[PDB]
Point group: C2
Chain length 392, copies 2
């Protein structure tokens, strides 16, 4: 069959780009796959699969549609005449694409691969799941099935997860320049400083943990950008002053903030270098920035939300359930409700993993647990298999 | 003595205005009080106390300082030569006034009456509590004392609460336009629709309550202005679908969103008409938007936060403890951390008060308990005692 995938270009250093680079050449040996590649950062990565770079095509035409090239898609399909069109993005972007192909000549079967991050998304986006042209829906986790059904989807739903690989680098603490801290247990939260990721909770919990154990040899690493809404040091500072602990400033410096941009091998280095991986976010589609270190046999503390909660557990990981729920309609055009963990539960989790006997045991469990997870091959073959049931 | 109060003009229909209208003429019979009244909406309300209208004076000068008239204060003090200047506002505004009076010639003793709503306010605001001209600090509730101390205040701190009088009004439900709902028990949240007030949670708990008691003669009233960030019917709709309950739209209609504006008679009427008063906010300075119902002997559901927790005993009211904490630095220049209740604790609170016997018992208890709260006379008298003690 002939398959058009509307998604991230191979040059894109993002979550979407990463799954595109994995899935595209794997489906290519079963079918003809042609990529409408969006948001290109540079050169295409495949020698022999047809990848259209939609962003520079949009610049050539003098349009600015943020690299989505909504105006080009209808003609692209009309020419190629695919058996299937898979659209892989969030619900807003998917909506835009379905409108753009409303005056499309070729009758094509549409498969959605939706990135969902919150329960109860806006009702005005629900129509995409029951659009006449849509013939199957693909979700990234089991938990999203019942939402998608609640949104009124009546076509087959298939779960398409991801596979995680991180390069295992020896002597990593030295190589990232963290050799002062050879004695310290390093907690690492690799998430960006945005509202969903709740770095405020992370650093509040760090501050509380430190005020309760002011001599523990411990560091809390995290990321921040210029003029993020949360100033992480300032948050922690105020929590240390309120606890009454002495030497506020020295405890404060136990939270280490990286402000520089990622290079993909500093990121891998960080995971190898640290002792505990932490994600306390509000919502997770797949539950990416964490499972990354499970292959390395690092203990994990995770908020049991969305996919993260499905991905893990016969108790290989330290799971914290949301203690309260809020609307997140104010963040985003997509919105929903999301679950917020109790700062004190994260403190308890940090104190569980200050014991190296627990780090060892849990590191071992998740390493073994993730050996079982299906690889890009198993996943991509699942994809094509789901595609074959939808044509004949 | 000669006292200048920098606060809300008498014409202002806000919380600040309401306390200014109470305290000014009460202190006026002990001392000479002169008001630098800010943000005027209209005519001054006192016949014989000197009330300067700062906003219109600012317009006359062609300035726009949002009605605070920061540029007029220093000269106003230099002329009047008061014994004390009381600045009554939040910490940012207080900071602005202290900077504006930095080239003031008259040496005057400053008393702060700070409105605090959150713990852990930004460290760059803390200087106001130990500023060289500040000689006392007044706070609205006991819980704020230890914060104010932590921010490094070394001068006397006095607690100056508020008195609530709502009139009692016979056949209120008929008189406010609620006569179609005679069978129902009416839950009322009178708070404005802002992030701190958490109407997302109120409406999410209403939706959930309804899903599991489809048949309860119940209604959840609340307010909403032109465009806030929370669309409450939309948030409620989504939750209703998620629950799986039939007849979604007739159930949506038990959440009644008032958009019409409040005459003060009608606000008071709302309180008399309803059966249960609800406040699920994240932070509360004094404990305002509920105290109102108490004098009427209405049962109350309140989140146990800030001043609201100091004001009510656990035995006369239904208190829900925060289940999680987040930073609120993103809302605001003040910031801090605030405590969020769990939606399901509110559902349990609703079900408690669907029992008419519980409403009767708890209505009677709040009414009895609040009988002995300080009066505007006691409060104002205690304000003058504090000032006297600071003057020698």
């Amino acid at each position: 069959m002939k398959l058009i995938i509307v998604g991230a270009h191979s040059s894109v250093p993002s979550g979407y780009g990463r799954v595109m680079r994995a899935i595209v050449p794997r489906i290519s040996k079963a079918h003809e796959v042609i990529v409408f590649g969006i948001h290109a950062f540079g050169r295409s990565v495949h020698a022999n699969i047809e990848e259209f770079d939609a962003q520079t095509a949009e610049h050539v035409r003098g349009l600015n549609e943020q690299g989505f090239y909504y105006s080009g898609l209808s003609e692209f399909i009309d020419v190629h005449k695919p058996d299937i069109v898979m659209i892989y993005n969030d619900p807003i972007v998917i909506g835009n694409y379905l409108l753009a192909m409303g005056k499309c000549s070729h009758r094509t079967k549409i498969v959605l691969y939706v990135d969902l991050v919150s329960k109860n998304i806006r009702e005005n986006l629900w129509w995409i799941f029951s659009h006449p042209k849509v013939v199957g829906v693909m979700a990234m986790s089991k938990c999203w099935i019942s939402d998608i059904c609640n949104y009124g989807c009546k076509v087959p739903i298939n779960i398409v997860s991801h596979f995680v690989d991180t390069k295992t680098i020896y002597d990593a603490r030295k190589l990232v320049g963290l050799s002062e801290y050879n004695d310290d247990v390093l907690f690492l939260n690799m998430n960006r400083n945005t509202a969903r990721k709740r770095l405020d909770i992370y650093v509040l919990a760090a501050a509380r943990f430190i005020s309760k154990y002011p001599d523990a040899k411990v560091r809390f690493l995290c990321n921040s950008h210029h003029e993020s809404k949360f100033d992480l040091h300032s948050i922690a500072l105020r929590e240390l002053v309120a606890s009454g602990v002495d030497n506020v400033f020295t405890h404060l410096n136990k939270i280490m903030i990286n402000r520089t941009v990622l290079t993909d091998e500093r990121v891998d280095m960080m995971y190898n270098a640290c002792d505990v991986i932490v994600n306390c976010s509000s919502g997770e589609g797949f539950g990416l920035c964490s499972a990354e270190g499970a292959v390395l046999g690092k203990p994990l503390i995770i908020s049991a939300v969305g996919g993260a909660d499905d991905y893990f557990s016969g108790d290989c990981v330290y799971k914290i359930k949301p203690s309260a729920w809020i609307s997140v309609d104010d963040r985003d055009g997509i919105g929903g409700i999301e679950g917020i963990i109790d700062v004190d539960d994260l403190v308890e989790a940090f104190t569980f993993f200050k014991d190296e006997k627990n780090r060892k045991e849990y590191g071992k469990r998740v390493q073994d647990f993730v050996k079982t997870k299906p690889t890009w091959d198993d996943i991509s073959s699942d994809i094509i298999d789901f595609f074959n049931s939808l044509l004949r």
